[model samples]
Every structure is written in C-alpha cells, then in structure tokens.
Target: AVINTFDGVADYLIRYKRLPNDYITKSQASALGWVASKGDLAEVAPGKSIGGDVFSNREGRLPSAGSRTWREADINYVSGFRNADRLVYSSDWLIYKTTDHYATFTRIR
Candidate 1:
C-alpha cells in the first residue's frame, strides 16, 4: 500500500506503532517515532548505543511492513541524542541520511 501524504504516512505509523486509541494520530505517531527503539538490549553493552527503529512499507523496495535494515551509523546518531529531548530529531536524522544515499526514497516532509 502506498501512503501518498505525510498525514497518511503518519496515520500509518501511528497504527504501526500500535498506539493507544486515545493517542492515535500523526502527532502521537511522531512521538512514537522518536523513542520506539529504547531498551531492547543491555545498557552496558551495544544496547547503550542503540536507539529507536521505525519501519514502513514501500511498494517494491521495502515491500513489507517488516522490511528494514538500519545501518550502524544511523543508530549511533540516535544513541547520542539526549533522552526525552524529542525523537523527531533522531527520526529526521535517519530520513536525511537515508535520502542522502537513496535519493529515490519518497517519505519526508
């Protein structure tokens, strides 16, 4: 399924994040987008340097909701951001880096 607008994609993300009904919307989704990947590993290990991960579906490229492979560099940036400072920064970082390499990607403001 192709999400044609930021709003549409935001809605999709909200659902993808399994957000609460009371908290469902792009604003909520954007919030989820920020810190969704916290605490999946040990803090003393590489987990300390890992941040959130968000995924989406792209027609033929990332064909499924599960199709995503983050690079180590991207995670490093997120890991350094101040906790609770807002995840949109990290989220934007990922988008910017990905587009810098994969120019055809179509999901930004």
Candidate 2:
C-alpha cells in the first residue's frame, strides 16, 4: 500500500520490517527536487520523502554493531513544511522513532 503518514510508515515497518519500494533515497529524492531543510517536492514527486537514506547515527543514540546500517524515513511530511518526526530502522535488530528531529529516540522494536 501507499504509506505516507507517520503511523502508516510505522505500521509498514512493523508488518514488513522495511520501507516500501516507493521510498526514495536522499540523493534520488534530491534529483526529484526534495530539499531536506524545506520539505517541498510536490512539483517533482508528490507525496514522497528523502527516506531510505543511510543514517549514520553520529550521535550514537542507537545500538552499534559491526557493519550494521541504519535507514531513515520522514514522518508526517507535507508540502511546504518541515517534518520533525522520523523512523530510523537498523539492518540489525532495532527500530527507533524520533519525534524531535533526532534530538531524542525511542526504541520501537
């Protein structure tokens, strides 16, 4: 299904344990006119986010393991507004929900 909202993304994460195929990486979304600071991309690709991008977890808020990668998805994103919520999923066995733009994280899985 077309997952666009925060809740829907979370549901998809729990059900499929991965972001849908429709999700585009940050660079791909950028090519489609997605600006991270300004969540505006309707003209290029409607109802899409710069998700599926590799999240480095520089703050070390989540767990770490050898060769584990983290992916991020924007939550509740609407054209012309910056979304604060995001879903960070790990390749290992962790899923974190952040409502404060990476300021804090809560493990959901």
Candidate 3:
C-alpha cells in the first residue's frame, strides 16, 4: 500500500533514502489534473500525496547552505484538505518534520 502517514513515510525514507513510488510532486500532479487550491489530488491522482518539492527556506528555520538542498512532503493527508504536518529532508540525508508548516521543525533523522 502507499504510505501516507508521517511515521510510515519517514521510516521508509530513513531506510531507503528516497520517497516511495507513490509520491508525486505538485507539478506532476497538476498535469494529472490536480489543483493545489482545490486540493483535489486524491481524486485526480489517487494513492499519491504532494511531495518532492524543493523547499524554499525563506523562513530560515531550517539549516541552509549552498551545497545542501531540502525537499518537502505532505503528511497524514486523507482527503482534499491538507494539514500542517510536513516531512522535510535534505540532500545530505538529514530529515525533519514541521508540525506547524515550517514555523518550527524537529529533526527526524
């Protein structure tokens, strides 16, 4: 089954160092008729969650460097609505979670 929960996806990424096949980027889903404002991802792209987008650290809450890039994924998404829970990971293999949508973050890996 496609992993949707925060712990499930985080555990998988910790072990495999990559998002599972079910994860898709926002643009990828958009092409599949997924709309961000409408949050109709589960309908247009079933079994997939928004993920793998380069996180712009404009908030300066997470570490930043020219060599390391960060990616973000949605967590616990079951419907068209989205929650603040998010999983973030860096190119250097560090992983983190932000319960408040980047207002603050806790390391997961």
Candidate 4:
C-alpha cells in the first residue's frame, strides 16, 4: 500500500516537477521527529508495537517495536523521501539520519 501510494505520488511529482503544493517539505516532514514522543505508529495490520526495546532514561519503558522496520518502512527510500521528499527505487534497509529520538524508514520492493 505504501509502495503504491509512493508510486502514484512519485509519478505525479516526476510528471509535474511538484506535488499538490500542499505536499509536505523535507524539513517539514522531518520536523515530525521533534514532536514525536515515541516510536512509529503501530496502527496498521496486526496492529502492535515493533523495533527493539530501546528506551530513554526519561520515557521509561518503550512500547512494542514500530513499523519503521517493516516492509513498508524501507530505509533507503525513506531516507531520500525525507531529505528530498523524493523516493528512491531501492531494495535495501535504507537507514537515514540517526538521532536521539528515533530512526525513520520505509519499505520498498
């Protein structure tokens, strides 16, 4: 579903050289990290937390791992998507900006 969503969005961007203007920007999208208080949203299928049980001294115990490592959260593609807001046709676990908050990613076929 994310691939298809990204594909359709990418196709539109490539053809138009821009998204619907309202489309989120790289920094803007990345800024989400500042506001995030925990791991990725585990609301999708078989809904549950994911990722290793890493936590901060302040936040206490972490929830289940997030879907950031899931197939839909390919690292490479998500990296490019975050930096340039452009998707990369990769098939690897693309790890982007590592920080104190959390790592961001997306899965790609």
Candidate 5:
C-alpha cells in the first residue's frame, strides 16, 4: 500500500505499528543529499518519510523498560516539507501519534 497522505500514514501506523520499509531512513535520505533545512529530498528519494531514527523517549511519559528503544516516523509528510506530525513506535509494540511534533502523543495501541 502506498501511503501518500497524513490519513494514510496514520492508518498505516495504527495497523502496523511501524512505518513501512518503503519509507526511507534518515541516513539513507541524508546520503541521498536530503537536507531538512531545504526540503530537497523529492528529487532523490521521492515519497518517503524523513524518519527511521531511534527516538529516545527521555521524557518518560511513555512506558519504559530496561533497554527499550523507540523508533519514529514523520507522518503526513509530503514533498520535501512537513509540519510536526510524527508516529512513534516501540519495540514492545506500543504505538503513539503526535501531530504537534511531540508536544503531545496519543497512544494507538
């Protein structure tokens, strides 16, 4: 399934608890010359999220266990730009959605 919009991204996150591998990782995008300041990823890695980075849940708001880590994805991101929408996932299978760029999160599952 090609997730092209915010709704699609959110639905996919709710269903899968993780972004599809089709979404490029940060390093992969960076290697392709993706610059967050410029939003120049479309030419190199089209239709991908500027995600796949390990999210350090340092705030302790989300449930935490010893050595558990969370992964993050940019939701509703299109072209080379984005707002603050993000989908955060944990190894324990916890999923959260943050539309305000981590200001607040709603646990989906």
Candidate 6:
C-alpha cells in the first residue's frame, strides 16, 4: 500500500506531484476526529497516511533558497508511532528521502 513504504509513497508523488488519495493533512484528519496524541487515524479513515504539509527544513538539509518550499509525508509509520523514514518533496519536482529523521537526506527522484 502507498502508506506502507518510502518507494511506494514516493512513486505516487512522482506520478502526480502530490500525495496519494490515501493521505490526509493534519487538519483533515482532525476534522475526521483524529487525535494526533491518540493515533486513531485508522478509525477515521482506513489505510491512510498523514501528508500534504509544508516542511520548514529547520535543519537546512533540503534546498533552503527563498520561496523554495517543501512538503513531507510519513513513511513506514505504524499506528501513532512515526518512523524516521520521510518523503520530503517540492513543487520543483524534487524528492528526497530521509532515513535518519532530519539529520541527513538522499534525493530519491
């Protein structure tokens, strides 16, 4: 499933320049009664992943030029426990995978 892996979700974004239909923003999930601290996404929408939010790139690992924004999604997340795997992408069609949280990143597409 797209929500289960980095390659899977990354491929979805590469094809559409956006998250898969199975993803929801924090606000969207909240509207569906999802509580972040509770990890009840499955209750509101089955087999969905959290996505479609801007990534601030606080670590400056990704491109940080002015107005060069990015978005991120969880990869291989289970229940409410987020994994280190994440997909950071931009409207410029650049995509990167970070395996060690935000410490380092590798361009995947």
> Best lDDT goes to which candidate?
3
For residue 106, model 4's alpha carbon misses the true position, in angstroms, by 13
RMSD of each: 14.4, 2.3, 1.5, 14.6, 2.5, 2.0
Tens-place lDDT per residue, model 1, 51-90, is: 2334332334422324343221122122333232111112
Candidate 5 structure quality by residue, lDDT tens digits, 1-109: 5574555655676677677765888889989888878878776777666777899888897789987889888777667576788877787767788888788999876
Q: Estimated TM-score per prediction? A: 0.19, 0.80, 0.89, 0.26, 0.80, 0.83
lDDT of 2 by residue, 1-109 (tens): 5576666776777788778766778789787777756646655677666588888878778888888989998777666665788888888647788889899899777
Residues 48-94 of candidate 4 have per-residue lDDT tens digits of: 21221212323312222444221111121322112223233212233
What clash count does candidate 1 reach? 1
Query: Positional deviation of 84 in candidate 1, in angstroms?
Result: 21
| TM-score quality measure for candidate 3 | 0.89
Q: Candidate 3 — number of clashing residue pairs?
A: 0
lDDT of candidates 1 onward, in order:
0.30, 0.77, 0.85, 0.29, 0.76, 0.79
Candidate 2 clash pair list: none
Candidate 6 to truth, TM:
0.83
Which regions in candidate 6 have their CA more than 4 angstroms from the true location?
Answer: 1-3
Best TM-score goes to which candidate?
Answer: 3
Where does candidate 3 clash, by residue pair?
A: none
Model 5 lDDT, residue 16, Cα: 77
Task: Give the lDDT of residue 8 in candidate 1.
Answer: 43
- Where does candidate 3 stray beyond 4 Å? none
Tens-digit lDDT track of model 6 for 47-104: 7778888888787778777668899887776566556878888877788988898778
Order of the predicted models by lDDT, top scorer first:
3, 6, 2, 5, 1, 4
Candidate with better lDDT, 3 vs 4: 3
